[PDB]
Amino acid sequence: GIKSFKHKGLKLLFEKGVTSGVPAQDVDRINDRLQAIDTATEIGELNRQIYKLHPLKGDREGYWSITVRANWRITFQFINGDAYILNYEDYKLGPEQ
Ligand SMILES: [Cl-]
Ligand SMILES: [Cl-]
């Protein structure tokens, strides 16, 4: 399950159905990714072609990324079947990752 958020927009969407903090057009796909993270018990369940699952490195060691659309990505820690510190970002990852 999802246990914590860094990004208030994702938190409000997931917990309350409030859509103010994300692009309107993306609400359904963001909910799809959140629901996938929430129901996964192992990280490989998120290794779906359209999700572009990627473990992050360096200062982001311990985090994972999945893609909503374009460069829109949800990042999180995944530990003992639960997801933590969920964040939302809009940029492509660089070569050191
Ligand atoms: Cl939280
Ligand atoms: Cl796992």
Curated annotation (Swiss-Prot):
Gene3D superfamilies assigned: RelE-like
Source taxon at top rank: Bacteria
Keyword annotations: Endonuclease, Hydrolase, Nuclease, Plasmid, RNA-binding, Toxin-antitoxin system
Site (Interaction with HigA): 14, 31
InterPro entries with a match to the protein in the record: HigB-1, RelE/ParE_toxin_dom_sf
Nuclease is among the record's keywords: yes
GO molecular function terms listed in the Swiss-Prot or TrEMBL record: mRNA binding; ribosome binding; RNA endonuclease activity; translation repressor activity
One record GO biological process: negative regulation of translation
Keyword RNA-binding among record annotations: yes
EC assignment: 3.1.-.-
PANTHER family recorded: TOXIN HIGB-1
Subunit structure: Forms a complex with the antitoxin HigA which inhibits the mRNA interferase activity. The heterodimer dimerizes to form a HigB-(HigA)2-HigB tetramer that is able to bind to the DNA.
Function, in words: Toxic component of a type II toxin-antitoxin (TA) system. A ribosome-associated translation-dependent mRNA interferase. Inhibits translation by sequence-specific cleavage of mRNA. Prefers either in-frame or out-of-frame 5'-AAA-3' codons (lysine). Also cleaves the first three AAAs of stretches of four or more A sequences. 20% of codons containing AA are cleaved and occassionally cuts even at a single A.
Protein name: Endoribonuclease HigB
Organism annotation: Proteus vulgaris
Gene name of this polypeptide: higB
